[PDB]
C-alpha cells in the first residue's frame, strides 16, 4: 500500500530520499601499502578506467585534453566521452568522426581518473566523521584498493577481507570542498576527544620502540639507506654520535631527523619506574624512559604507544597542533618508511620460544595454584560447617561466591605476575606489549601461566545439569575446577572439561559482540536525528532550524573541540 | 587415587569426540582461544578443495577445485573418519611469522610469487549457465538459434560470432565478458518479428567453455547447460586462512629472490605478521608449525588430537633438536634484498594453509553512469546489475558533520536521480508542461502564465505524487 511503501525502511522517505544508490562509486578489497602516503590511496586500473571526471576544455588545457581524446577509451589515460556545448555527448568508443574529435573551449572531455584525483573513501558502518576521508589517487597495477596502515585506525579497518567504497567528486566545486575540508591530513585530530585519530601502528610502533633504544647503533651504510627513505631530509648527514673508534650513528639521532621542525614534548615510556622521578637519576634515566624532545631533536627516551600513538600530548598531536597538518602528514609517512626499512635489518617474530618460561617459573605458578585450591577448599569447609558469616547486604551464597572468586582471582593475577617476571628482554610477546602495538599483559599471562576463571552471565560456570556443571563432576561441587577455573595455560593445553568451559565463556563474548552492534546502531541514529540541524550561526549562537537558541555560545566558550588541550590551572591546589 | 568418586557408572570413549565435523580438522584445538576455534569452523566451510570426486560429471554453479590439494602434515586422528585425507582442502605451506616489508601488516599475508608460479594455491572456477527453450507461450516460441542483426529487429552489439548453428557456443572457445554464451530467439506476435533473448556472460568471467550439454528437462522442453572454466592464480587480494582462525588477504607477492631465505635455501611460501598471534592467542598455530617441521623431517604425519597428554611442546622441541634445527623452531634468516642476516631469528615452519572462496576478482565493482531503476529512476543495485553503492543515511550524517553541503548535494541528488518538474506558482501542485509545444498550463486554476521550473530528485517527485494519491497535497510554493 502507499503507506507501506513510504513508512518502512527502504521506502521512499528513507531508502530512496535520505540515502540512495549513487553513480561514480566503486568498491573492492583493501590491502596494505606502507609506501603510499597518508592521503594517497591506490586505485586499480580497471576501476580508474571506468570512472571518469569531466574536465572543461580551456585554452590552457586544450592540448592535453586533445591528446586524451585521441587516445580513446582503450588506452588507459584516455577519455570516455566528449560533451559539446550543445549538450550532445560523443561517445568515443563507437567511432567518432575525425571532425568530432576536435575540441574547442567550452567542451567537456570526460577523462579517465588519473593520479592525483581527489576521491572520498568510506567504510561501512560510518560511525564517525573520520570514516569518510578524502584521499588522493595513485594508480597501481593490481585489483585492490591500497591505503596506508596509519589510516586504518580511523576507519577501524584491517586487511582480512575488508572492503571500502570509493566516491569520485564530479565537479571542481565539490572537489575543492573535499580538498579543503575532508582530506586525511586535515582530520588527524578529532574534535570528539581532542586527541589525534591516527597514530603509528603495528610493525612501525613495535620497531620504533626497538629503534629508539639506547642500544641501537647504526653504521654508515645503514644510515645512508635509512636517510634515503626520509622525504624531508635536508641532504646533510648528521654528525655521528660515536665518532671513534668507528663512526656509528644512534637510533634516536636518525629519528631526530624525522621529527618535524622544532617540537618540544615530554612523555613517559610505558615501563617507566614510578620511583625514578623522585629519586636521583631522574633526568639521566637509567632505563632510558622519559621521552624528551627539545628543538625537534630526541634527547632521550624510548618511543612507544604513548609518544607516537593516539593520545593527548603525543608527538603526533603536538606536531599537528604546532607545525600544521601538512608537515604532520609528512611526519607520519616518514616514520613509517624509515622505520619499516630498518625493520628489514632487525626483524620481528613470534615463536613458541616466547611462550615457554623457565622451569622455576612454572613451579612457582603451580605452587600458587596448589595453595589457591587449598584455600578454596577451606572456604568450602567453613561454609559447610556454617561457620561462614554473611557479608552485609549479601546472602551466604553470594558471599561464598565473593570470597571464592577473590581467592581464585588473586591466584590468577599472582601467576600472571610470575609469568611476566619470567619474560626476558628478547621475548617478542614483551616487545609487542611494551610497545603497545598489540596484546596486553593479560594475554601474556594466559599464554604462559593461567587462562583464568571462566565466567558466564557474571558468575562462575552454572549448574546446567542437576546440581553439577558437567556429568563428570560430583553433585554439589563448588570447587575451583568444577565451576570453571582453567589452571592450564594455552601453551600447556586445556583439559577437556576446561575446554568446554572456555568455549562457554568465548560464546558469551561472541553473543555480546553481536548484540552490541545492533543496539548501538539504533542509539546513534536517534541521536543524529534529534540534533541534526543544530549549528553555529554567524551570531556564534548555536541554533536549531526553528532558530531557537540552544546555546548562546558553542560549548559555553565558543571554541572548537580540536584546538583545545589539557592544562593545569596551578592556582587551585596550592595552600595559601 | 585420592578418593574423588568410587561410583563411576560410565566412561567417555574419547573426549575429542565432543567436537563436530568442522572443528575436528583444527589441530591442537585445546591450545587456541575459543573464539578462534569458532572462527575456524566457519572459515573451513569456505575453503577450496576437491569437493567431490565426480566433479567432472556434475554441472554445478560456482564450483571451485584446487589444483594440488595436500593432506595436513599435522592431522587429528578423527580426521580419518571425516575423509579429510581423501579429499583435502588446502596446501601445507612453509610459513614464516615475521615482519618483512610491512605488506603483511594487519592480517595481510606476503606470498611467494615463484611458488605461485609453480602451482601453489592455484584453483579452477566452474560456472554453469542453464537455459530452457520454452514453447509454452500461445504465440511465443523461444527457439535456440543464432540471432542475426538484420533478421532480428531486437538485437545487441555484443559478439555473436562465437555461437554455432544451434545457438550454443562450442566447448573449448574462449569467452570474454559480455559475450553470448547461448543464443535464443522469441518469435514476436505481429500485432501491427524478433525481440532478442540471448544470454550473456557475467562481466569479467574471462573463461574457456568446458562442457556444453543439451537435454530435455522435467517439463520436456529442450534444456542446455554450459559450464565455463576459469583458472584462478592467487593475487594480491585473495583471502587465505590457516586452521587456527587466522584469516588474511595477500598483501603483496615477492619472487623467490626477494623473499628471505634460510641458509639451506628455503624461502617462506607465506609470511604472516607476528602481530596476529598475541592478541588472538592462537598458540595452536605455533605448535602446529613446530610439529610440522618435526613431521616433515621425520617423515611421519604428526598427531594433533585435542587432548592427548603424550604430546607436549617440550617433547616436540626435543624431537626437532634431534634433526638439526633450533629446538623452538626459530631459524636464522637472511634478507633477500641485501643478503644481511636478519638480527632477530624468524620462526619458520610448515603449516597447513587454506584458500578461501572470497577472491578479489569476484568482489571488484565500479559504476559510472549506468542503468537506472524503473520505479525510482535511481541507479540499480548489485554487481551483476552494475549497481552503484548506496550512500546510506549514516553516510549523509557524516557528510553533514563535515559541512560538505555541495558534495552531499551532488551525491544525493545530482549523481543519483536528477529531475526537473514544472510547478504552478498560484497552487503548489505540479502542472502539465509540453516542452516541445512550448505551452505550459495548470489544471484547476485555468492559469498558464504562472508556472515555475523546479529541480528535485525523482524520488521526491514520486513521494509527492504518492502523497497526492493519499489525498495529501504537498503544495510546494516557491514564494
Amino acid at each position: 500500500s502507499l503507506k507501506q511503501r513510504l513508512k518502512g525502511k527502504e521506502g521512499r522517505v528513507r531508502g530512496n530520499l535520505m540515502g540512495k544508490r549513487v553513480d561514480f562509486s566503486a568498491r573492492t578489497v583493501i590491502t596494505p601499502d606502507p609506501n603510499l602516503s597518508i592521503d594517497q590511496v591506490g586505485v586499480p586500473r580497471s576501476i580508474a578506467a571506468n570512472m571518469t571526471f569531466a574536465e572543461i576544455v580551456t585554452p590552457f588545457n586544450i592540448d592535453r585534453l586533445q591528446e586524451l581524446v585521441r587516445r580513446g577509451n582503450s588506452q588507459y589515460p584516455g577519455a570516455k566521452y566528449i560533451i559539446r556545448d550543445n549538450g550532445d555527448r560523443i561517445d568515443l568508443r563507437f567511432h567518432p568522426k575525425p571532425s568530432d574529435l576536435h575540441l574547442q573551449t567550452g567542451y567537456k572531455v570526460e577523462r579517465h581518473m588519473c593520479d592525483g584525483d581527489i576521491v572520498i573513501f568510506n567504510r561501512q558502518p560510518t560511525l564517525h566523521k573520520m570514516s569518510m576521508m578524502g584521499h588522493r589517487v595513485r594508480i597501481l597495477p593490481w585489483s585492490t584498493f591500497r591505503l596506508n596502515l596509519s589510516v586504518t585506525t580511523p576507519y577501524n579497518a584491517d586487511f582480512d577481507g575488508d572492503e571500502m567504497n570509493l566516491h569520485l567528486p564530479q565537479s571542481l566545486e565539490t572537489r575543492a570542498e573535499i580538498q579543503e575540508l575532508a582530506m586525511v591530513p586535515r582530520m588527524i585530530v578529532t574534535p570528539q576527544s581532542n586527541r589525534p585519530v591516527m597514530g603509528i601502528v603495528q610493525d612501525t610502533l613495535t620497531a620504533v620502540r626497538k629503534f629508539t633504544k639506547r642500544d641501537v647503533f647504526l653504521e654508515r651504510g645503514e644510515v645512508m639507506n635509512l636517510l634515503m627513505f626520509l622525504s624531508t631530509w635536508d641532504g646533510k648527514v648528521p654528525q655521528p654520535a660515536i665518532l671513534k673508534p668507528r663512526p656509528l650513528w644512534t637510533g634516536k639521532q636518525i629519528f631526530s631527523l624525522i621529527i618535524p621542525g622544532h617540537i618540544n614534548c615530554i612523555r613517559t615510556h610505558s615501563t617507566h619506574p614510578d620511583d625514578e622521578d623522585s629519586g636521583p637519576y631522574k633526568h639521566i634515566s637509567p632505563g632510558d624512559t622519559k621521552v624528551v624532545v627539545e628543538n625537534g631533536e630526541l634527547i632521550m627516551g624510548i618511543l612507544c604507544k604513548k609518544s607516537l600513538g593516539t593520545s593527548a600530548g603525543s608527538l603526533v598531536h603536538i606536531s599537528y597542533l604546532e607545525m600544521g597538518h601538512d608537515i604532520t602528514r609528512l611526519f607520519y609517512s616518514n616514520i613509517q618508511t624509515v622505520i619499516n626499512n630498518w625493520l628489514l635489518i632487525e626483524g620481528h617474530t613470534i615463536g613458541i620460544g616466547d611462550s615457554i618460561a623457565d622451569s622455576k617459573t612454572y613451579q612457582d605458578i603451580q605452587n600458587t595454584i596448589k595453595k589457591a585450591k587449598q584455600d578454596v577448599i577451606e572456604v568450602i569447609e567453613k561454609a559447610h560447617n556454617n561457620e561462614l558469616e554473611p557479608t552485609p547486604g549479601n546472602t551466604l551464597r553470594q558471599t561464598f561466591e565473593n570470597q571464592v572468586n577473590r581467592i581464585l582471582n588473586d591466584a590468577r593475577d599472582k601467576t600472571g605476575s610470575s609469568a611476566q617476571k619470567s619474560l626476558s628482554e628478547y621475548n617478542n610477546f614483551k616487545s609487542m606489549v611494551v610497545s603497545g602495538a598489540k596484546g596486553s599483559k593479560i594475554n601474556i599471562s594466559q599464554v604462559i601461566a593461567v587462562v583464568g576463571q571462566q565466567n558466564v552471565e557474571g558468575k562462575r560456570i552454572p549448574f546446567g545439569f542437576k546440581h553439577r556443571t558437567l556429568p563428570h563432576f560430583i553433585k554439589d561441587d563448588y570447587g575451583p575446577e568444577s565451576r570453571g577455573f582453567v589452571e592450564n595455560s594455552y601453551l600447556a593445553g586445556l583439559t577437556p572439561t576446561e575446554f568446554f568451559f572456555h568455549a562457554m565463556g568465548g560464546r558469551e563474548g561472541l553473543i555480546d559482540t553481536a548484540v552490541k552492534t545492533a543496539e548501538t546502531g539504533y542509539i546513534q541514529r536517534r541521536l543524529i536525528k534529534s540534533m541534526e540541524s543544530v549549528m553555529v550561526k554567524y551570531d556564534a549562537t548555536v541554533r536549531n532550524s526553528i532558530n531557537q537558541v540552544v546555546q548562546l555560545r558553542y560549548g559555553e566558550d565558543g571554541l572548537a573541540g580540536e584546538s583545545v588541550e589539557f592544562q593545569n590551572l596551578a592556582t587551585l591546589k596550592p595552600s595559601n | 587415587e585420592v578418593a574423588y568418586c568410587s561410583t563411576y557408572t560410565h566412561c567417555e570413549i574419547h573426549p575429542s569426540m565432543i567436537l563436530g565435523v568442522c572443528a575436528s580438522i583444527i589441530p591442537f584445538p585445546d591450545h587456541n582461544q575459543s573464539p578462534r576455534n569458532t572462527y575456524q569452523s566457519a572459515m573451513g566451510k569456505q575453503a577450496m578443495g576437491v569437493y567431490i570426486t565426480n566433479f567432472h560429471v556434475r554441472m554445478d554453479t560456482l564450483a571451485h577445485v584446487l589444483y594440488y590439494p595436500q593432506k595436513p602434515l599435522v592431522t587429528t586422528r578423527s580426521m580419518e573418519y571425516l575423509r579429510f585425507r581423501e579429499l583435502p582442502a588446502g596446501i601445507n605451506s612453509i610459513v614464516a611469522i615475521a615482519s618483512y616489508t610491512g605488506y603483511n601488516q594487519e592480517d595481510s599475508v606476503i606470498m611467494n610469487r615463484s611458488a605461485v608460479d609453480r602451482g601453489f594455491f592455484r584453483s579452477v572456477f566452474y560456472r554453469s549457465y542453464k537455459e530452457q527453450e520454452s514453447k509454452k507461450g500461445f504465440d511465443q516460441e523461444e527457439v535456440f538459434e543464432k540471432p542475426t542483426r538484420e533478421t532480428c529487429q531486437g538485437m545487441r552489439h555484443a559478439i555473436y560470432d562465437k555461437l554455432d548453428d544451434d545457438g550454443l557456443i562450442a566447448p573449448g572457445v574462449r569467452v570474454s565478458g559480455d559475450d553470448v554464451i547461448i543464443g535464443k530467439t522469441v518469435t514476436l506476435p505481429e500485432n501491427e518479428t524478433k525481440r532478442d533473448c540471448s544470454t550473456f556472460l557475467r562481466t569479467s568471467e574471462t573463461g574457456i567453455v568446458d562442457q556444453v550439454m543439451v537435454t530435455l528437462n522435467q517439463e520436456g522442453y529442450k534444456f542446455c547447460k554450459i559450464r565455463v572454466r576459469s583458472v584462478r592464480i592467487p593475487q594480491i587480494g585473495d583471502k587465505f586462512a590457516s586452521r587456527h582462525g587466522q584469516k588474511g588477504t595477500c598483501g603483496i607477492q615477492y619472487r623467490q629472490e626477494d623473499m628471505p631465505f634460510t641458509c639451506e635455501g628455503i624461502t617462506p611460501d607465506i609470511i604472516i605478521n607476528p602481530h596476529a598471534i598475541p592478541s588472538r592467542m592462537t598458540i595452536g598455530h605455533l605448535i602446529e608449525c613446530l610439529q610440522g617441521k618435526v613431521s616433515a623431517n621425520k617423515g611421519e604425519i604428526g598427531d594433533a588430537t585435542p587432548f592427548n597428554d603424550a604430546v607436549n611442546v617440550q617433547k616436540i622441541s626435543n624431537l626437532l633438536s634431534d634433526y638439526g634445527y633450533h629446538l623452538r623452531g626459530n631459524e636464522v634468516l637472511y634478507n633477500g634484498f641485501t643478503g644481511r642476516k636478519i638480527t632477530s631469528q624468524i620462526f619458520i615452519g610448515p603449516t597447513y594453509y587454506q584458500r578461501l572462496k572470497h577472491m578479489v576478482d569476484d568482489k571488484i565493482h565500479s559504476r559510472a553512469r549506468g542503468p537506472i531503476q524503473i520505479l525510482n529512476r535511481q541507479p540499480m543495485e548489485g554487481r551483476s546489475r552494475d549497481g552503484g553503492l548506496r550512500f546510506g543515511e549514516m553516510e549523509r550524517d557524516c557528510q553533514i558533520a563535515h559541512g560538505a553541503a555541495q558534495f552531499l548535494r551532488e551525491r544525493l541528488f545530482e549523481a543519483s536521480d536528477p529531475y526537473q518538474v514544472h510547478v504552478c506558482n498560484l497552487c503548489g501542485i505540479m502542472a502539465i508542461a509540453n516542452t516541445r509545444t512550448h505551452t505550459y498550463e495548470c489544471r484547476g486554476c485555468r492559469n498558464k502564465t504562472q508556472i515555475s521550473l523546479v529541480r528535485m530528485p525523482y524520488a521526491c517527485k514520486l513521494l509527492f505524487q504518492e502523497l497526492m494519491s493519499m489525498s495529501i497535497a504537498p503544495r510546494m510554493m516557491s514564494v
Binding site: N405, L408, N409, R412, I442, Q446, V451, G452, Q453, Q454, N455, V456, G458, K459, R460, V486, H502, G505, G506, E508, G509, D512 | Q33, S34
Partner: peptide
C-alpha cells in the same frame, strides 16, 4: 575467559 571483573 579471564575472571569475574575482567572479560568472560
Amino acid at each position: 575467559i579471564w575472571g569475574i571483573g575482567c572479560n568472560p
